[PDB]
């Protein structure tokens, strides 16, 4: 995980998100003793990314067929990286987090999002 | 006619709205629908006072005492949490004489007038509790 | 037993939670309070004696009287006494579901039934 | 050390870690009803300064012996304290700076004298010795007024009798929940400061002052008299 | 020590002492850490009542008065029961804990509580 | 450092000195915290000694000629002695501070005192 094996968008996007879940795993505390909510709109913002983000890292597998029934799903990086650009840039706002459960790739998110 | 009437007691209050009748002793049962003129303030007696909504509501508000301003569009009153409205000051003062300085004469029979006397000596106890 | 320990682990986890505050219980909301005073009548309920095995249907009657809201009327002191009281209420009056439980092992809505109507008529009538 | 004496040691320190973040919890919640408190009680103040400030806009010709001043003489402080520990010493803070302040006032030559609410000023502040009018203590978490009457009493009857002029009180004020300062403040002089409110728009009819034109009105400065105090013992309590 | 060969009484009698001291043990960090004041009000009694159990195991020998001068002591096996089961119940509270030094039976207790 | 090998007089002169240096090191914080302002009587003294003593144990070395004017100095025992006792017996109080810094003897430090 370096810029030079894997290039600058990819080291960018992955620090980005690991940056994003170590200041939530910062706040959880604040919000656990001091309270919820009494602070500011980007802390706030932050939580709920990081939310959609735990999310957005489940997926369904191939060798669990047999048992649950949903196909399996095997998502190219580039979608990997485009969704999470996306997620990271705040265009998925507004779409309910459990969209991004056992979901896959992004565009199936979308689906899921505008069948529910 | 009546929009808001609140008392309020230590930490507490309520709300008033259109009261139709409302009933206080000392006063002739002044209070009711608001008759907004004449502004005053009077003693509000340790007697309780009736309140009547609409339409024949009816409910009991215990006062213990004190203040009561009446001004067109406004009624407000400042109670006390108990009987005290008599300006008692030997009875209210006859625990102090037993807790307030009594305690600390058991306590402390010091009785050394301050002055600020030892303040090196307190200098010295804030930078021995400063170690920690 | 696979049915009913779900309840008896979930209890411990959460008193091995919150036990700290056992001396602060009354500065807490009703929700943690409750769940601590389970914890505790729970972690009493395991006390046993040397030389007294239990059998499947005195421990299914057991952790069916703790999991529901029974056991929360008891002081915490006297869990002990009332449980042995209820076990020996049973094989006297309702030996005949002793046995289809201890021969059997099966867990049905008819036995749910049973076990519960048996609880209820020992807190109803007799005394411990 | 030995190795017994380190493992012994490693889950003692745990078992205090985790009694230690119970406490911490505990003060949290603690802390917040008491916020919850001070939002109910500050209508109550408010209110106590719009009918003062009505009444004086009122009645401006005479004014009773509370809005009096007299030089300078024999002045008298009110001190508020916890009864327990563990406060990282903010009784410490308001002890060193009132003081200080004591100590300015002796140089500029006028004995003093207080009162005590606080158990610590009384357990440590008086092994030193002082001239004292009262200590109440163990008032406990939401005091009422009837465990703190007397002692406001008596230190402002010593001013009634004239043999103090000045009373200050001294208490913690809460700004952030990480963030609380000692503050001095006069009451018993009770100088205006805000006379602007209620002069622009109307209230020129003030009160026909039925029951008593000009008589009754000293009472109403007891309760407040007996309000702001009370105000400020609750604040001190919060940022404990 | 068995409850079918000492008896009942005997049994919890000892159970309850041997669970006083346990507690008490574990109190000495939090003392050593948190004032005396910031403890229970059962911790307080169960710190007391296991310090004067403490001192009550104490009595002189028959043969160790070279070393003191005070005479030996045989207390029987009633005698302690009785005692221990007063101490445990709460009656001894108001008696100092200097008093249960090297003093036999119980009743030599109550009467040296007069001397110190 | 003994009285009986080297005599009560040199024992005493000792062990008064590294009482200052100790009070010094143990008020050094409160110093830190703040000037002598802060400071009470009897110890801004004890400060003022203690670096007057500090910037005492300077001293000009022979092996330093190339780059000192001065050829050195060999101060005796006795001399030694005699200035210790002297400065803390509070005399030399009044001598202004850096007298005593690369001056070695104290009798050369009074004569640096005088010239500046």
Same mark, same amino acid.
């Given at each position: ?116 | ?132 | ?39 505790? &009548? ?87 | ?40 009680? &500050? ?179 007891? &309760? ?17």
């Amino acid at each position: 995980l370096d810029p030079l094996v894997v290039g600058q968008e990819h080291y960018e996007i992955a620090r980005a998100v690991q940056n994003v879940l170590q200041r939530y795993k910062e706040l959880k505390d604040i919000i656990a003793i001091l309270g919820m909510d009494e602070l500011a709109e980007e802390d706030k913002l932050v939580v709920y990314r990081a939310r959609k983000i735990q999310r957005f890292f489940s997926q369904p597998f191939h060798v669990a067929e047999v048992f649950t029934g949903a196909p399996g799903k095997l998502v190219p990086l580039k979608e990997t990286i485009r969704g999470f650009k996306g997620l990271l840039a705040g265009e998925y706002d507004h779409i309910p987090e459990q969209a991004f459960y056992m979901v896959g790739g992004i565009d199936e998110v979308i689906a899921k999002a505008e069948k529910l | 006619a009546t929009m808001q009437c609140d008392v309020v007691s230590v930490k507490e209050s309520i709300y008033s709205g259109a009261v139709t009748m409302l009933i206080a002793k000392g006063a002739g049962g002044e209070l009711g629908i608001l008759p907004g003129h004449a502004p005053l303030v009077t003693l509000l007696q340790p007697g309780p006072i009736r309140v009547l909504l609409e339409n024949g509501t009816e409910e009991i508000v215990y006062v213990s005492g004190g203040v009561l301003e009446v001004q067109p569009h406004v009624v407000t009153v400042l109670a006390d949490t108990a009987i005290r409205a008599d300006n008692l000051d030997e009875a209210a003062i006859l625990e102090a004489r037993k807790n307030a300085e009594q305690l600390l004469a058991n306590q402390k029979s010091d009785l050394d007038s301050a002055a600020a006397l030892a303040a090196l000596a307190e200098t010295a106890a804030q930078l021995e509790t400063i170690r920690k | 037993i696979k049915k009913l320990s779900g309840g008896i682990r979930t209890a411990l986890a959460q008193y091995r939670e919150l036990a700290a505050f056992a001396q602060f219980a009354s500065d807490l909301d009703e929700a943690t309070r409750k769940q601590l005073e389970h914890g505790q &009548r729970v972690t009493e309920l395991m006390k046993q004696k040397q030389y007294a095995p239990y059998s499947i249907a005195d421990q299914a009657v057991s952790v069916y009287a703790s999991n529901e809201g029974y056991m929360a009327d008891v002081e915490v002191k006297k869990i002990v006494d009332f449980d042995a009281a209820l076990i020996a209420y049973f094989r006297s009056e309702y030996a005949p579901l002793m046995k289809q439980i201890d021969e059997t092992g099966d867990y049905n809505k008819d036995i749910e039934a049973a076990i519960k109507a048996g609880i209820e008529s020992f807190k109803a009538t007799q005394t411990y | 050390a030995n190795l017994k004496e380190i493992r012994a040691k490693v889950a003692s320190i745990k078992s205090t870690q985790k009694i230690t973040r119970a406490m911490q919890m505990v003060a949290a919640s603690k802390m917040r009803r008491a916020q919850e408190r001070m939002a109910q009680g &500050r209508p109550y103040a408010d209110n106590m300064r719009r009918v003062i400030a009505h009444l004086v806009q009122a009645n401006p010709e005479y004014k009773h012996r509370y809005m009096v001043d007299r030089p300078v003489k024999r002045v008298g402080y009110i001190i508020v304290s916890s009864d327990r520990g563990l406060a990282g010493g903010l009784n410490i803070n308001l002890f060193k700076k009132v003081v200080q302040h004591v100590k300015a006032q002796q140089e500029q030559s006028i004995e003093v004298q207080f009162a005590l609410i606080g158990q610590k000023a009384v357990s440590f502040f008086k092994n030193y010795g002082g001239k004292v009018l009262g200590a109440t203590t163990q008032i406990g978490d939401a005091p009422s007024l009837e465990q703190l009457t007397g002692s406001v009493q008596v230190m402002l009857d010593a001013f009634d009798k004239g043999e103090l002029d000045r009373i200050y009180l001294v208490s913690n004020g809460f700004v952030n929940a990480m963030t609380q300062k000692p503050k001095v403040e006069q009451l018993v002089p009770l100088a205006p400061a805000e006379e602007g409110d209620d002069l622009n728009r109307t209230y020129g009819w003030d009160y026909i002052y039925e029951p008593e034109a000009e008589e009754l009105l000293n009472g109403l400065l007891v &309760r407040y008299i007996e309000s702001m105090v009370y105000q400020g013992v609750i604040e001190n309590v919060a940022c404990e």
